[PDB]
């Protein structure tokens, strides 16, 4: 119900462009795997679209053909929007080609995703605010993650994360500025070991995008561990993939927006040990840091953490980001079952870019986002299905 069409670009996706010397076995393999992918999408009622600029000629064993008759011969269950053949199609890098497809097929923006590799296609999808699916089977990418190394991975992403009705296992709201989402419920019997980076970034990407949560998001960030001596264990493992998801949302990932200045249950323990970094890394390739604090006023920011139990961590993140004027979304991989989230607001003013020390009495507990009333009416099974996924019959 969420995904209704997949747009495919050509360059280094359907046909290798950058390098004419791809292994000859590879191109035939990719052609075979792409037929499986398109038949899979057809099997689910999902439309296959090719979006191209030129009806270029394609060297074949039999001779040269046009791109149109190449695609219709090799992948007949398809819709070819070729700008050279139809002046009504706008230039793709402006993102307006997305709006065209939306109207032509009567589809919403986030009922579509965009498979591509070239920077031109990355622009076309992100300028169109459509989720980018970076295909890297012909041309590798080393700068960031959230990649799809072969067509099968796109089918795995769709089947596992994009077809179910329930994108969030738990979600709740309070006032107008408190918004909590969690992918799956969690329960344990003790006081990456669950899943894998690619599993969690793909889970996040799908649920965030198809629920509509990514609309207007400017920033993605993670929280900090309790240990001042090692506060970025999660961010460090997830950095590569979060960089890629931010590129795909056309947002910016701030790895070190939160500082744990002291090692850290009353929520004061979190508030009194963290603050916003006035100079986080602006250029994750260089390590170049902001010259002035990031402008968070009026900006939507997605705060990602692994576990949400009673909300002490997320509420501290929200408190600091709210004090700096941001609009905050609190997202979690896992929500502990039968534990309520206590929502808090500070009585005294917060200095968000430096350390604060609040009393117990400086906390106003204003409400609760209970568990049983916010569950969407299994993680074990989802990881197994993803880890063991293969083409169906």
Residue closer to Cl ion, measured from CB, 53 or 218: 53
Segment interacting with Cl ion, rule: CB under 5 A, options 4-12, 14-22, 117-125, 145-153: 4-12
Q: Which pairing describes strands 341-346 and 327-336: parallel, antiparallel, or unpaired?
A: unpaired
Residues 6+ apart with CB under 8 A from 174: 343, 366, 367, 369
Nearest-CA neighbor of 132 among 143, 145, 120, 121? 121
- State in angstroms the smallest separation of the CB of 127 from Cl ion: 17
Binding of Cl ion at residue 10 (CB under 5 A)? Answer: yes
CA distance 242 to 302: 11
- State in angstroms the smallest separation of the CB of 141 from Cl ion: 20
Nearest-CA neighbor of 320 among 288, 290, 344, 289? 344
**Which string of DSSP letters, residue by residue, matches 291-330?**
SS----TT-EEEEEEEEESSSHHHHHHHHHHHHTT-EEEE
Q: Which residues, 139 to 158, sit near Cl ion by CB under 5 A?
A: none
- State in angstroms the smallest separation of the CB of 52 from Cl ion: 4
Residue closer to Cl ion, measured from CB, 58 or 235: 58
Segment interacting with Cl ion, rule: CB under 5 A, options 8-16, 28-36, 309-317, 350-358: 8-16
Q: How far is CA 44 from CA 147, 163, 210, 260, 285, in A?
A: 23, 9, 17, 47, 39
Residue closer to Cl ion, measured from CB, 70 or 168: 70
Residue closer to Cl ion, measured from CB, 15 or 331: 15
The pair of structure tokens assigned to 119 is 């920077």
- State in angstroms the smallest separation of the CB of 287 from Cl ion: 36
Residue closer to Cl ion, measured from CB, 53 or 332: 53
The pair of structure tokens assigned to 239 is 């950095």
Residue closer to Cl ion, measured from CB, 114 or 371: 114
Segment interacting with Cl ion, rule: CB under 5 A, options 3-11, 33-41, 227-235, 241-249: 3-11
- State in angstroms the smallest separation of the CB of 136 from Cl ion: 18
Q: Which pairing describes strands 178-186 and 327-336: parallel, antiparallel, or unpaired?
A: parallel
CA distance 217 to 281: 19
Nearest-CA neighbor of 204 among 185, 219, 182, 221? 182
Residue closer to Cl ion, measured from CB, 119 or 384: 119
- Residue that is written with structure tokens 């994750």 in the block: 284
Q: Which residues, 39 to 68, sit near Cl ion by CB under 5 A?
A: 52-53
Binding of Cl ion at residue 15 (CB under 5 A)? Answer: no
Residue closer to Cl ion, measured from CB, 116 or 172: 116
Residue closer to Cl ion, measured from CB, 116 or 151: 116
Which residue of this chain has its Cβ atom nearest to Cl ion in the complex?
Answer: 52
CA distance 312 to 268: 9
Segment interacting with Cl ion, rule: CB under 5 A, options 7-15, 36-44, 348-356, 379-387: 7-15
Report how far apart the first and last C-alpha atoms of the chain are (Å, whole number). Answer: 22
**Count of residues near Cl ion by CB under 5 A:** 3
3-state secondary structure of 206: helix
Binding of Cl ion at residue 162 (CB under 5 A)? Answer: no
- State in angstroms the smallest separation of the CB of 83 from Cl ion: 9
Residues that bind Cl ion (CB under 5 A): 10, 52-53
């Amino acid at each position: 119900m969420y995904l209704k069409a997949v747009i495919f670009s050509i360059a280094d996706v359907v046909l290798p462009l950058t390098s004419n010397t791809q292994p000859q076995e590879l191109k035939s393999r990719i052609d075979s795997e792409l037929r499986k992918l398109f038949a899979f999408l057809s099997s689910k009622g999902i439309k296959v679209i090719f979006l191209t600029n030129k009806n270029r000629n394609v060297r074949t064993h039999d001779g040269i053909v046009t791109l149109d008759e190449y695609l219709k011969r090799k992948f007949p269950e398809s819709i070819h929007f070729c700008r050279e053949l139809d002046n009504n199609i706008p230039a793709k890098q402006t993102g307006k080609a997305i709006d065209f497809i939306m109207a032509a097929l009567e589809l919403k923006r986030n009922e579509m995703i965009y498979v591509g590799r070239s920077q031109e296609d990355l622009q076309a999808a992100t300028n169109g605010n459509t989720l980018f699916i970076n295909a890297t089977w012909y041309e590798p990418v080393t700068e960031y993650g959230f990649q799809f190394s072969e067509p099968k991975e796109i089918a795995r992403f769709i089947d596992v994360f994009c077809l179910r009705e329930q994108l969030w296992g738990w979600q709740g709201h309070f006032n107008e500025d408190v918004h909590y989402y969690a992918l799956a419920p969690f329960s344990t019997y003790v006081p990456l070991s669950v899943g894998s980076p690619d599993f969690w970034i793909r889970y996040l990407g799908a649920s965030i995008y198809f629920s509509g949560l990514s609309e207007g998001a400017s920033f993605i960030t993670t929280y900090v561990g309790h240990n001042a001596e090692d506060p970025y264990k999660l961010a460090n493992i997830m950095e590569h993939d979060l960089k890629g998801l931010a590129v795909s949302f056309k947002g910016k990932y701030l790895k070190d927006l939160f500082l744990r200045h002291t090692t850290a249950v009353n929520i004061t323990s979190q508030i009194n040990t963290v603050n916003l970094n006035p100079a986080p890394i602006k250029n994750l390739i260089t390590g170049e840091r902001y010259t002035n604090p990031p402008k968070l006023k009026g900006k939507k920011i997605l705060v990602i953490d692994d576990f949400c139990t009673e909300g002490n961590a997320h509420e501290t993140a929200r408190m600091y980001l709210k004090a700096a004027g941001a609009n905050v979304i609190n997202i979690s991989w896992l929500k502990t079952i039968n534990r309520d989230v206590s929502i808090c607001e500070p009585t005294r003013k917060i200095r968000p870019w430096e350390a604060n020390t609040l009393d117990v009495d400086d906390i106003n507990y204003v409400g609760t986002i209970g568990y049983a009333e916010n569950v969407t009416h299994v993680l074990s099974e989802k990881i197994q299905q993803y880890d063991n996924w293969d083409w169906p019959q």
